[PDB]
């Protein structure tokens, strides 16, 4: 015919050419969705970026976690569409804070979000995810962690571990998850009578009390076999991501303003881009990179 390829044909193309895969967090825009090869949570990328066969990572997610695709890959070219993905809640947490928190608990393991910057990471003993947080301080030698950067997880850890936990920085917080209010479960009770509440431990506490589950995406999705209606308090694409794996489900957003501007600086037209002229090219300095690789292996061990 007179017609030629779109974007995705363009980028399918690309994918062949370089040897690529397209891995994807949970958050993307659905069309983004549609094209990557392996779409999950910030637990789910780091595991599979244990195991790239291919030479190439375009990664439609933020730089942390790109970056966390990196120092896995240190060989591989990792790329991020925009450098301007990038995460409020990560950026809030900085080498001194580490460091002060250091100084008064030396004997406190440092356990860091996968939410945070690779410098960070190179200070930390384990990193962990809204998925196995509480499996590994539950696990750690001590009865008292320092962690960061999130305090709403860090208050769910507390809860669920009964340890002493030691936030850096005292407020890092994501303003998407921020967000959800006591009305917005009000609400979604009284629109939506016979769903659940599925509930991202980045909540603040008094939200979090009111789930049935408190979960991380990948949790959200492993649980979501145990109902039939969910709302969802967390990222508004999950929706679009919940949806296309259960069919057969309904799914609410609890707040449809709750978008990540970082996530949703990724676009159809620069993943085409990425591909098509190699960039942006992630890389991670040597020495951080060997002490984030530590900890984030001990993570993946640990869970
Ligand atoms: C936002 C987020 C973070 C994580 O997995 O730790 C999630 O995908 O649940
Ligand atoms: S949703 Fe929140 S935690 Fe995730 S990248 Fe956006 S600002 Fe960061
Ligand atoms: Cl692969
Ligand atoms: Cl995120
Ligand atoms: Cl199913
Ligand atoms: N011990």
């Given at each position: 015919?007179?017609?030629?390829?779109?974007?995705?044909?363009?980028?399918?193309?690309?994918?062949?050419?370089?040897?690529?895969?397209?891995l994807?967090?949970?958050?993307?825009?659905?069309?983004?969705?549609?094209?990557?090869?392996?779409?999950?949570?910030?637990?789910?990328?780091?595991?599979?970026?244990?195991?790239?066969?291919?030479?190439?990572?375009?990664?439609?997610?933020?730089?942390?976690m790109?970056?966390?695709?990196?120092?896995?890959?240190?060989?591989?070219?990792?790329?991020?569409?925009?450098?301007?993905?990038?995460?409020?809640?990560?950026?809030?947490?900085?080498?001194?804070?580490?460091?002060?928190?250091?100084?008064?608990?030396?004997?406190?393991?440092?356990?860091?979000?996968?939410?945070?910057?690779?410098?960070?990471?190179?200070?930390?003993?384990?990193?962990?995810?809204?998925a196995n947080?509480?499996?590994?301080?539950?696990?750690?030698?001590?009865?008292?962690?320092?962690?960061?950067?999130?305090?709403?997880?860090?208050?769910?850890?507390?809860?669920?571990?009964?340890?002493?936990?030691?936030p850096?920085?005292?407020?890092?917080?994501?303003?998407?998850?921020?967000?959800?209010?006591?009305?917005?479960?009000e609400?979604?009770?009284?629109?939506?009578?016979?769903?659940?509440?599925?509930?991202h431990?980045?909540?603040?506490?008094?939200?979090?009390?009111?789930?049935?589950?408190?979960?991380?995406?990948?949790?959200?999705?492993?649980?979501?076999?145990?109902?039939?209606?969910?709302?969802?308090?967390?990222?508004?694409?999950?929706?679009?991501?919940?949806?296309?794996?259960?069919?057969?489900?309904?799914?609410?957003?609890?707040?449809?303003?709750?978008?990540?501007?970082?996530?949703?600086?990724?676009?159809?037209?620069?993943?085409?881009?990425?591909?098509?002229?190699?960039?942006?090219?992630?890389?991670?300095?040597?020495?951080?990179?060997?002490?984030?690789?530590?900890?984030?292996?001990?993570?993946?061990?640990?869970?």
């Amino acid at each position: 015919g007179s017609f030629t390829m779109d974007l995705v044909e363009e980028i399918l193309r690309l994918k062949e050419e370089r040897n690529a895969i397209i891995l994807a967090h949970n958050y993307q825009l659905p069309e983004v969705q549609d094209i990557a090869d392996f779409i999950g949570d910030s637990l789910e990328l780091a595991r599979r970026a244990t195991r790239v066969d291919a030479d190439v990572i375009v990664f439609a997610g933020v730089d942390f976690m790109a970056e966390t695709a990196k120092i896995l890959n240190p060989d591989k070219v990792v790329l991020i569409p925009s450098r301007e993905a990038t995460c409020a809640m990560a950026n809030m947490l900085k080498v001194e804070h580490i460091l002060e928190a250091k100084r008064k608990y030396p004997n406190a393991p440092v356990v860091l979000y996968v939410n945070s910057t690779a410098e960070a990471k190179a200070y930390a003993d384990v990193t962990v995810t809204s998925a196995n947080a509480v499996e590994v301080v539950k696990k750690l030698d001590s009865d008292v962690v320092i962690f960061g950067p999130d305090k709403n997880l860090a208050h769910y850890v507390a809860k669920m571990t009964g340890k002493k936990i030691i936030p850096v920085p005292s407020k890092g917080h994501c303003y998407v998850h921020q967000k959800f209010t006591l009305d917005d479960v009000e609400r979604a009770k009284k629109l939506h009578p016979n769903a659940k509440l599925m509930i991202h431990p980045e909540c603040i506490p008094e939200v979090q009390e009111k789930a049935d589950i408190i979960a991380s995406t990948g949790g959200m999705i492993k649980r979501a076999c145990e109902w039939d209606e969910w709302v969802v308090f967390t990222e508004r694409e999950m929706v679009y991501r919940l949806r296309k794996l259960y069919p057969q489900k309904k799914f609410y957003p609890a707040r449809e303003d709750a978008f990540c501007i970082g996530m949703k600086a990724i676009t159809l037209k620069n993943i085409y881009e990425s591909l098509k002229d190699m960039k942006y090219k992630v890389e991670v300095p040597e020495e951080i990179a060997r002490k984030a690789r530590k900890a984030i292996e001990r993570m993946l061990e640990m869970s």
